[PDB]
Amino acid sequence: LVSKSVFPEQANNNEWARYLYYTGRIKAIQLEYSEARRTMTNALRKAPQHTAVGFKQTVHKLLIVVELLLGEIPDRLQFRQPSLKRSLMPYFLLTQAVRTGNLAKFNQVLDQFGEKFQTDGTYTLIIRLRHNVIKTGVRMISLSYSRISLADIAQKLQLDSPEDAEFIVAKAIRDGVIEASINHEKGYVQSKEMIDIYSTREPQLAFHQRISFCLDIHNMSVKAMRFPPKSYNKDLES
């Protein structure tokens, strides 16, 4: 159905937030974690509204699971503060699990939780989530160090054994977001990162995304700003 795509700006604030969430589910299972994350985040933000309140709790359930699979971590602290707190509560255990680097705690909790998601059809994702905690874990270790031994990574991340630990760290590496190499017969991981934005052009690249996003705001703003006062003078100005 999604292929027709039409959605005007004169659409209501609740219909927009609903629309973003639904697409977000379809993407996430297809294995577009990257695209899925984006649409769902927009949905929470765009409608604060009042009919949205009821919907927002649903958005928060999905929000925490998708974002964790993509590779980024949020804080349990962020979630607790709003008064929609009541729906975030099982969710606090999951956020913490990924962040500490605790594979074993994260998947077991999620398998049992999987039931609730089935109504939504989010459940197929729950299986894939076992991987992401190990990946998040490796990411903090890779950036931090240069060469750190294989035994150290296995203890902190809460990997199954030292034999599990070499294979799994490797799978993350292929994608390239970790950007390392793992020495199996030498039992250390080496950081290919020697990263810095101290370079020639590179800081502009960082600045560029911010600058691009601003344009979308600027145009939307300009176009919109003039049209309501000119109308009221035209018809009933109150």
């Binding site: 913490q96 962040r99 500490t100």
Partner: peptide, 24 residues
């Protein structure tokens, strides 16, 4: 882990005692 400070009070004490006896 919500706040590192509770855990850290035990960590610093424990870690020093073991480390000192051995190497330092």
């Amino acid at each position: 882990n919500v706040e590192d400070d509770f855990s850290n009070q035990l960590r610093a004490e424990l870690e020093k005692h073991g480390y000192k006896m051995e190497t330092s």
